[PDB]
């Protein structure tokens, strides 16, 4: 009773449709990187909160016009000025300083010439204003940039450094955001040893757990390492129950081929009572990829049972798991970014859509990047930042050639 | 004595030329994300370490040809088989299982038909092999993938999840890598309050420290928050000395305009005895950007004194600081990725090269992304992932138009 071959498109939209959006929590704004706001954010103050000089120069009365002026003082950053500027007077200003009462324009220092300074040269006393200021010129009025009561960030915003800066600006230091998913990862197989182990007969080292944990951590999500679980139903069930208790998402690898001692799909259905939405996907690599949900007490747990083959495990993790995690953490459109790139060599198409890690590189002034499939010196050292997404062959199209434009999913920093 | 206007190109190559590469340390391979290897890494074992089946099926003698065979047992994942396959016999195998002595090919289960099983149906006893196996078919010989003594990762490799997986595979759990830079960030100005503060007259909240710390943290580097420092030389000097003691890199903002009570450049030169390599850059925004080095006891400290304007501070941090940090952490080519994109609206060029945060988006099947400068509903919510890099105007070129292809530095995940 093998599972139906699910099309890639159906498998992907099934993952997104079935994956929940996690609840919310309040965080400190400094912890906001990558978080999605679950509230609108409003300014409680004006920016600037005082009329502010745009320039180093002098606060003047525009109606005085050009001419020679007594400097009555300086408006300093961080100090509300005392003095009122009267006709024939000016006050020195620096960028960002408050404009004193009496002044209605700023003349930048380049449009002036100093007439008199103190004997020790530390204080300016008289200045020539060379231009006719326009009223308001080189002043940021109160609220020019942000007004009190303005919504400055909308719920749904996926925050980066500039948004954290905006929170700092408006003094909203605690915000409601969606939670991040906690992702538990286990490996399965009697043949597996820990990375720390010397080899024993018949055995290999577990690489998927490391690769998958690192992939998830690269996207900023907390992880739980559930170790290596042997090929038997009791141990698998116990490990899955641990994952369910400790995490929002359980990723397994291995144990999902058709054939002997691959028990995971049985355990998920009969013992765990999960709903397996697909158990095979028409894709290369990744045929045995399995996706299940488990609803407990009005909470939906997500389970990805990925293929054991290490290349398949990392490919399917990027295709299916990462977008699910993005939806769980509140990203409204959780689809991965897909770009167009030129194939760096000929490739044979399969009846299945096929996927392969690659390196994306821009060449001098050429508008499209090149995609070089993994496996020169320097290029063979590059870490993969793309996943080639090649179409199924048709009776028409059987091969794609060097230079032809293909889809590439971004999986690494470009 | 204002500093010369340094060209953008000179300022950038000066930063890279003058920035040191940090020393090395040994880390656990699980901590390797984003690290650069400072050693070659060799395999001490073969992969696979035993001849391994590619398929679920049967290990056979190819010389037997097709026909009916007694199944003498199963080769299980994780177990070295006991039995030798003799003429007329086969052993069941699963993918990854060791090939028993006596067998020289694997026939996949689809090319067989089962003849007899145990009464309870749990054990296969006799099978029909329908095909003539080629010797070696569907077996991964010892060392097929990785050979003992093979260099699997070269020094200089910038590691991602797949490299961490490869370390796990070959059991090299501790590796030499370049250190990451520790980056101290301070804000300057008597007008600044903490994000947590209510406003007071003449004051604003410090946003640059948050924005800069978040920018640095986004790239994975450890940070130190040095707070707000007032506009006076003693306090500035003390804060810089603290930064120097605690960190590899000091980022300040503010205090770098020409004019009153901007003391930082004096303090760096006269009090700290640093070498200021440039104090102005012909760029928009970012004119007062300052870069200095300080050599203490054969250690080179890096100091970036960025403009106080928040937009300028974040722009110059991405242009100058991030590439320096990349060089410090051992990345051989620390240049940011620059892509080609289409302008989403007309823009006026300046005599200075100009830079602006933007959002990069791909449109259905169009090969080039569009770049929309920051400042629709949904687009106005996007976090910036690009920095537009617009050329200086010429007597020829004065304006660029919607749809024209421009350079964009990637600063966010695409
Ligand atoms: N964690 C792992 N690390 C490396 N190889 C694995 C891992 N899990 C499974 N494999 C291999 O991938 C193949 C498929 O495993 P399975 O899906 O359990 O049949 C077999 O060759 C396994 O030995
Ligand atoms: N940390 C900061 N956060 C927000 N605005 C700042 C910050 N530092 C400086 N500014 C403003 O940027 C402008 C330039 O400051 P400065 O370079 O100190 O003259 C002035 O308007 C300052 O008030
Ligand atoms: Mg297995
Ligand atoms: Mg200042």
UniProtKB/Swiss-Prot annotation, chains A, B:
<keyword id="KW-0511">Multifunctional enzyme</keyword>
<keyword id="KW-0966">Cell projection</keyword>
<comment type="function">
    <text>Also has a catalytic activity and catalyzes two steps in the biosynthesis of the molybdenum cofactor. In the first step, molybdopterin is adenylated. Subsequently, molybdate is inserted into adenylated molybdopterin and AMP is released.</text>
</comment>
<keyword id="KW-0808">Transferase</keyword>
<dbReference type="GO" id="GO:0005856">
    <property type="term" value="C:cytoskeleton"/>
</dbReference>
<keyword id="KW-0460">Magnesium</keyword>
<keyword id="KW-0067">ATP-binding</keyword>
<comment type="subunit">
    <text>Homotrimer, homodimer and homooligomer. Interacts with SRGAP2 (via SH3 domain). Interacts with GLRB. Interacts with GABARAP. Interacts with GABRA3. GABRA3 and GLRB occupy overlapping binding sites. Interacts with ARHGAP32; IQSEC3, INSYN1 and INSYN2A.</text>
</comment>
<dbReference type="GO" id="GO:0045184">
    <property type="term" value="P:establishment of protein localization"/>
</dbReference>
<dbReference type="GO" id="GO:0009898">
    <property type="term" value="C:cytoplasmic side of plasma membrane"/>
</dbReference>
<comment type="function">
    <text>Microtubule-associated protein involved in membrane protein-cytoskeleton interactions. It is thought to anchor the inhibitory glycine receptor (GLYR) to subsynaptic microtubules. Acts as a major instructive molecule at inhibitory synapses, where it also clusters GABA type A receptors.</text>
</comment>
<dbReference type="GO" id="GO:0014069">
    <property type="term" value="C:postsynaptic density"/>
</dbReference>
<dbReference type="GO" id="GO:0061599">
    <property type="term" value="F:molybdopterin molybdotransferase activity"/>
</dbReference>
<keyword id="KW-0564">Palmitate</keyword>
<keyword id="KW-0597">Phosphoprotein</keyword>
<dbReference type="GO" id="GO:0006777">
    <property type="term" value="P:Mo-molybdopterin cofactor biosynthetic process"/>
</dbReference>
<dbReference type="GO" id="GO:0008940">
    <property type="term" value="F:nitrate reductase activity"/>
</dbReference>
<dbReference type="GO" id="GO:0015631">
    <property type="term" value="F:tubulin binding"/>
</dbReference>
<keyword id="KW-0449">Lipoprotein</keyword>
<dbReference type="GO" id="GO:0046872">
    <property type="term" value="F:metal ion binding"/>
</dbReference>
<dbReference type="GO" id="GO:0042802">
    <property type="term" value="F:identical protein binding"/>
</dbReference>
<keyword id="KW-0479">Metal-binding</keyword>
<dbReference type="GO" id="GO:0060077">
    <property type="term" value="C:inhibitory synapse"/>
</dbReference>
<dbReference type="GO" id="GO:0043197">
    <property type="term" value="C:dendritic spine"/>
</dbReference>
<dbReference type="GO" id="GO:0007529">
    <property type="term" value="P:establishment of synaptic specificity at neuromuscular junction"/>
</dbReference>
<protein>
    <recommendedName>
        <fullName>Gephyrin</fullName>
        <ecNumber>2.7.7.75</ecNumber>
        <ecNumber>2.10.1.1</ecNumber>
    </recommendedName>
</protein>
<keyword id="KW-0472">Membrane</keyword>
<keyword id="KW-0547">Nucleotide-binding</keyword>
<dbReference type="GO" id="GO:0097060">
    <property type="term" value="C:synaptic membrane"/>
</dbReference>
<keyword id="KW-0501">Molybdenum cofactor biosynthesis</keyword>
<dbReference type="GO" id="GO:0098982">
    <property type="term" value="C:GABA-ergic synapse"/>
</dbReference>
<dbReference type="GO" id="GO:0005829">
    <property type="term" value="C:cytosol"/>
</dbReference>
<dbReference type="GO" id="GO:0005102">
    <property type="term" value="F:signaling receptor binding"/>
</dbReference>
<dbReference type="GO" id="GO:0061598">
    <property type="term" value="F:molybdopterin adenylyltransferase activity"/>
</dbReference>
<dbReference type="GO" id="GO:0010038">
    <property type="term" value="P:response to metal ion"/>
</dbReference>
<keyword id="KW-0628">Postsynaptic cell membrane</keyword>
<keyword id="KW-0963">Cytoplasm</keyword>
<keyword id="KW-0206">Cytoskeleton</keyword>
<comment type="similarity">
    <text>In the N-terminal section; belongs to the MoaB/Mog family.</text>
</comment>
<dbReference type="GO" id="GO:0099645">
    <property type="term" value="P:neurotransmitter receptor localization to postsynaptic specialization membrane"/>
</dbReference>
<dbReference type="GO" id="GO:0030674">
    <property type="term" value="F:protein-macromolecule adaptor activity"/>
</dbReference>
<dbReference type="GO" id="GO:0060090">
    <property type="term" value="F:molecular adaptor activity"/>
</dbReference>
